[PDB]
Ligand binder design. Structure first.
Ligand SMILES: NC(=O)c1ccc[n+]([C@@H]2O[C@H](COP(=O)([O-])OP(=O)(O)OC[C@H]3O[C@@H](n4cnc5c(N)ncnc54)[C@H](O)[C@@H]3O)[C@@H](O)[C@H]2O)c1
Ligand SMILES: NC(=O)c1ccc[n+]([C@@H]2O[C@H](COP(=O)([O-])OP(=O)(O)OC[C@H]3O[C@@H](n4cnc5c(N)ncnc54)[C@H](O)[C@@H]3O)[C@@H](O)[C@H]2O)c1
Ligand SMILES: NC(=O)c1ccc[n+]([C@@H]2O[C@H](COP(=O)([O-])OP(=O)(O)OC[C@H]3O[C@@H](n4cnc5c(N)ncnc54)[C@H](O)[C@@H]3O)[C@@H](O)[C@H]2O)c1
Ligand SMILES: NC(=O)c1ccc[n+]([C@@H]2O[C@H](COP(=O)([O-])OP(=O)(O)OC[C@H]3O[C@@H](n4cnc5c(N)ncnc54)[C@H](O)[C@@H]3O)[C@@H](O)[C@H]2O)c1
Lengths: 337, 337, 337, 337
């Protein structure tokens, strides 16, 4: 099982770091036109959130040598031009943020990639898989280009699945309090695209409302919840770790204690490694580098009555997501190509 | 109408700044044992959020001279010892955070104060008034010690009143994304009281869940909503301005447009000066120094269906609250003593 | 005296805000291709540091109406294409950051501008004027394109002039602790140009060393100090206000008290409005919106001996600079064209 | 070699974490009256800078069990009352910040401690040792109570020793750009002691000048430099890692390259483990958890001429200092008692 990364950004670099921990997938090629091999080596070795790379990075010459293993480096604007097949890359992690359609992401298959995982929710009807929710619905004969959804969908959908299966979600509304991202700016200025005028405001001293499609995305991943969730985000100045705040009306009565046991039962059985739980007095920094998709915080939750609850789940939007994308690439490899 | 301030902290100092804008109430005495007159002058003249004091501050000698008017200064630990009557202070703004019972705050009446406004939700059954919600229920013959509730209750209760009167709230759950406060710490350490273990975590790099009684407080201020709201807070690193995120099931169908008109109608009529609205792409810094209790953000709100909505309202937790406390002191003066 | 702004960024917008306070210069046209008239109106009305615009902004139709006065708006990538003469703009404030040569900035004169002020230190030998230092050396018959230097050069050169004239600078080394800027990124990523690899690291949680040419620039503005100063910057997460820390060996003995009087004498005479001083326990937020170039902080300075001193001067890098650029445009207008 | 910790704050807790990495010293007792055993366990297991404790923490019952080893816990205000001898603690790390005299810190010897290390510069003439500078001057027959100096003195004195021995320091002035500390406040308020009025200003949005005695302290640790250094600090909002900026006139000519080799030679020989160096484009976050006292940043330094240089050295003020205090406790144990 071999992996190519297009776009060596926050997700592309932490996907690389996650594979270097992992014995059943290897990164064999990277493409990023806005950094040479030496700048790629620097942004890999040093991270302002995730700390110094655990291992060795050197430049061998238009290639990286990461823990002693050769990683071919490319600088191609066009996906059709990256020689993925020559490099021996079977799956491409597409993490540029700018090839989020089947039309655009399928051009990677001309380079000789077998499968493409988009690291984003798609602009079209590319199927989204979330690990431990609907990843086993994946059909290798039907799709070559798939999406791993967003950080937030990977947080919310495991929690929503547990809740819906055990109690039933009638109606739900999510807020995500979300750490800041590359789309935001250090000082007030024109947003790229003049599209989210608010995203362009000084990131470090503002609470910034954002639209997110994450909650409607849970309706694709869990069709039972189609039209039962919507949601909004609030961007805050912290550098990493985000929190989903899911308000739902339940079809059956459930105490927070009953919900906590339902979560604990799934975390210790079918969603081992994806869903986690805590009863500790935790704060966002406590999950930097957490590999779980979703950590249910028992003591932060509040119920109005047995039927109407607000549930709090943490997620490392950088590190948790990247582990899931590597999980899905391992899973997709096991199903053939 | 004359005002004494006990506790020259964030609320005590901005109450002073609000009165200096105001022609129908004057601050005549301050008490704070943890700052001398010269340090009081400094913390008044300079503010990291609210900017340089608009006017003159000098030390005349154990007294302040603020815009040319003498303000007597005291350094008394015990409220029974502050000579409020001698200084000519009729109302005491009690903003220490440590005399939030009738038992403790009534000791100010021994000093010759006529009325006490607690600048906090009380630990006992002191009545809470919120301006433009239930302030006209105040009976001067029945209470000498009253509370102005919290910043958050002053944000949520005007919005909840508008919504409940027009559509009816069945059930509601609030999240407040709240700017950081004096209870928090710059670095991880023992909380004062070892009570909110999470509040003691490094304030500047963490998202910190908090308990808040603000939403249950709306059930005292609006008895129709007793038991219909609860709520939680999330402390974030921004220095000022907070946002209430009210998820409610409504008894009547309402679009966000219908809710926006209901808010606009109340902001331009009975809640002039308390409730505001915006359709601009606003972010938290845009309300620093806003005197409104609550600014409804039309474009941040989201409805799941005609009956289940999430509403977003901003509030300057420092400046908006302080104006309301000065409003209530003016109102309480007009009712006698 | 009329002013056109090319580049409606942090400096372009605060130059506009400074002129709206000012009765002897008017902004008559703006050019920015990366924002339409409606987005320009938004970024003008709302500021995360400088607060809500003091006055009215509306869109009249591909034009702004700012405090009731028409400001023509353009969206041209090429300076040769902006019709400055048609709009009646005599001086162009060139604040894009990308036309910092005479070759590139002189193309504005094809549009019918008479004079160009670059809002940056130049990449070539365009002359730099600093107000109250060497602005009277300006020869209108010799130069049409001039530079206003940097924020830091405007802080350091008034202080260096006072010190050098009174005591004599033998050798000096500057550090500027500098608030974050549009060149920085919210999260770790490729710098624009792959040039300052460090500038591309997460701005909000890092102390970031930077190169600055500000101190060598003081050697152009004050030729007596050519080769006597160099300097470096440290970027820190605060949103605005910077501090120059000038370590100098002096040719004559001077106590900090003697230096404080020298500064006070110049602030109250020849550098009225440019150089300021404080003996208060000030912190960076206390100078947000300060119009001075340089505020000498007496109590932060330290001398090793009568000859070797470290001097601390604050500056609002956004607001102070923008006032100086408007000052220089008023001055340049008074000298002819 | 056994260690007791008085004061389980940032330094007390990271001293514990450093010993748990270390095979030649064991923490056997902790005293902190402002946290019970359960709150001590929480503040040990979770850290907003240093991440989750690497190992196990449980409460056995008024005792901790840390990686399976019993650590006795006390809650005594008075040092004379802590039974250090009963617990088997030979050295006491005194890290409260409030027993920084021989008079006060010697009361720990009544509890049956043999030696006391103050984790601070002393208010009196307690001797200061810095590891790899003057620690071998320590005489166990002459002193039972010693100081490990400050974080900054441990950064500056190794660098100053290398520079002075090789080139000679004529005169030097230090600035430290310093991460925020427990003395600072989240919002503007009275400083504890009304002493550093500036330290009491909102920590997260301000650049705050501070006095530091660190540079004069280098004159005790290196008597050759008595009266040759002074220095000041600037507190900035970052949560950890600080940078010393040493401007010195040298007695011999030295290029930054010659200084870099002098540092490299000492880092790889006599100051192995204390002094480090980097030529990478590093930023403060890159040294979180660095165990070095001082990391010389070649590419951030600047020389005016061969004789007058500004040198930049990083230090983790929390983690680097704590390792040095554990180093000194190991060293002091090896010399007898
Ligand atoms: N960071 C998060 O919290 C997060 C979490 C989940 C998903 N995502 C998604 O992942 C994607 C990337 O996010 P990010 O945070 O890493 O952003 P980023 O800006 O840090 O990374 C994008 C990278 O792609 C590169 N790139 C741009 N155009 C390219 C091209 N034509 N070919 C190759 N490389 C190109 C850029 O140079 C950059 O390094 C987005 O779709 C985003 O929505 C981000
Ligand atoms: N800041 C906010 O956002 C906010 C908003 C609404 C209400 N409040 C409430 O207002 C109160 C004060 O809040 P704050 O933010 O100003 O806190 P703060 O810590 O800034 O102010 C409290 C002040 O009281 C002084 N004080 C303490 N003990 C005293 C005594 N015995 N006598 C006199 N003065 C004494 C302290 O020195 C300090 O200056 C609290 O009850 C708080 O919950 C705060
Ligand atoms: N902010 C500071 O502290 C500061 C202080 C002094 C000087 N400066 C200098 O001023 C300049 C601008 O700085 P800033 O902080 O405002 O940056 P900014 O990024 O906020 O502003 C630059 C603006 O120019 C626009 N622009 C880009 N290309 C253009 C083009 N071809 N035509 C017209 N407009 C174009 C951009 O859209 C943007 O709005 C730089 O040279 C900078 O070094 C900045
Ligand atoms: N954090 C740094 O960067 C740094 C670096 C080097 C040295 N220091 C020094 O170390 C000392 C502690 O610093 P810190 O940052 O850990 O501060 P801190 O406030 O985090 O820790 C002090 C601890 O001492 C406890 N304490 C107070 N009174 C006590 C008493 N009578 N008995 C026992 N415990 C008591 C407090 O509860 C607290 O947990 C200070 O002298 C400081 O100057 C700090």
């Amino acid at each position: 099982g071999t992996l190519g990364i297009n776009g060596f950004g926050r997700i592309g670099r932490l996907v690389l770091r996650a594979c270097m921990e992992r014995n059943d997938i290897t990164v064999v090629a990277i493409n990023d036109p806005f950094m040479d091999v030496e700048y790629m080596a620097y942004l890999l070795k040093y991270d302002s959130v995730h700390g110094n790379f655990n291992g060795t990075v050197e430049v061998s010459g238009k290639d990286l040598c990461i823990n002693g293993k050769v990683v071919k480096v490319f600088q191609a604007k066009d996906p059709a031009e990256i020689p993925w097949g020559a490099s021996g890359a079977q799956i491409v992690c597409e993490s540029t943020g700018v090839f989020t359609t089947e039309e655009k992401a399928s051009l990677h298959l001309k380079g000789g990639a077998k499968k493409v995982i988009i690291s984003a929710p798609p602009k079209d009807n590319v199927p989204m898989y979330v690990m431990g929710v609907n990843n086993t619905e994946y059909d290798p004969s039907k799709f070559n280009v798939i999406s791993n959804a967003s950080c937030t969908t990977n947080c919310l959908a495991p929690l929503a699945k547990i809740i819906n299966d055990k109690f039933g979600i009638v109606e739900g509304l999510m807020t995500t309090v979300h750490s800041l991202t590359a789309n935001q700016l250090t000082v007030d200025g024109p947003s790229k695209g003049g599209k989210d005028w608010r995203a362009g405001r000084c990131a470090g001293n503002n609470i910034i409302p954002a639209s997110t499609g994450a909650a409607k995305a849970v309706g694709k991943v869990i069709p039972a919840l189609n039209g039962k969730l919507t949601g909004m985000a609030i961007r805050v100045p912290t550098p990493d770790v985000s929190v989903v705040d899911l308000t739902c009306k339940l079809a059956k009565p459930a105490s927070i204690e009953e919900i906590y046991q339902a979560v604990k039962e799934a975390s210790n059985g079918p969603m081992k490694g994806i869903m986690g739980y805590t009863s500790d007095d935790v704060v966002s920094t406590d999950f930097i580098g957490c590999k779980y998709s979703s950590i249910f915080d028992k003591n932060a939750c509040i119920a109005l009555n047995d039927s109407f609850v607000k549930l709090i789940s943490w997620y490392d939007n950088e590190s948790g997501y990247s582990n899931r994308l590597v999980d899905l690439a391992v899973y997709v490899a096991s199903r053939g190509l």
